[PDB]
Amino acid sequence: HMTFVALYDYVASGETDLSFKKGERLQIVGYNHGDWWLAHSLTTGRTGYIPSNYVAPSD
Amino acid sequence: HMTFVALYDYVASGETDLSFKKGERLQIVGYNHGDWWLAHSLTTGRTGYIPSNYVAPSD
């Protein structure tokens, strides 16, 4: 219900979410780019992961 | 270089990252599940997005 506006262009890499078992050991890739959210574009109708710092609150 | 251990199993949905243009309007899907990171499993060698609260710091 909160809506956001994209502040910059972002082109997808095609990475998907990762299946993993309890006990696996993992490392974060590109930590310096910050965290991500699953999002839905009202503009295009597409859905996928986006970087948090590319968007700001919007009407 | 920080390593994490998975505390729970997670099965991928197959969602990818999302391409978007500056100015698009977006909404977050499943905000209550928290944020995500791109990660690489040392255990399986696979890479993909994971939910932050499924992992803890590890040796």
Nearest in space to A12 (alpha carbons), one of A54, A59, A42? A54
Domains, chain B, ordered by start: 1-59 (2.30.30.40)
State both tokens at B23: 């100015």
Question: A24 CB near a chain B CB, below 8 Å?
Answer: yes
- The residue type of A59 is D
Q: Buried (b) or exposed (e) across A11-30, using 16+ Cβ within 10 A?
A: eeeebbbbbbeeebbbbbee
Q: Name the experiment that determined this structure.
A: X-ray
Contact A55 B26 (CB under 8 A): yes
The reported resolution of this PDB entry, expressed in Å, is: 1.3
What is the spatial distance between Cα A19 and Cα B41, in angstroms, rounded to a whole number? 9
Q: Which of A38, A53, A54, A55 to mutate to test the interface with B (most CBs of B within 10 A)?
A: A38
- Cross-strand partners of B57: B4
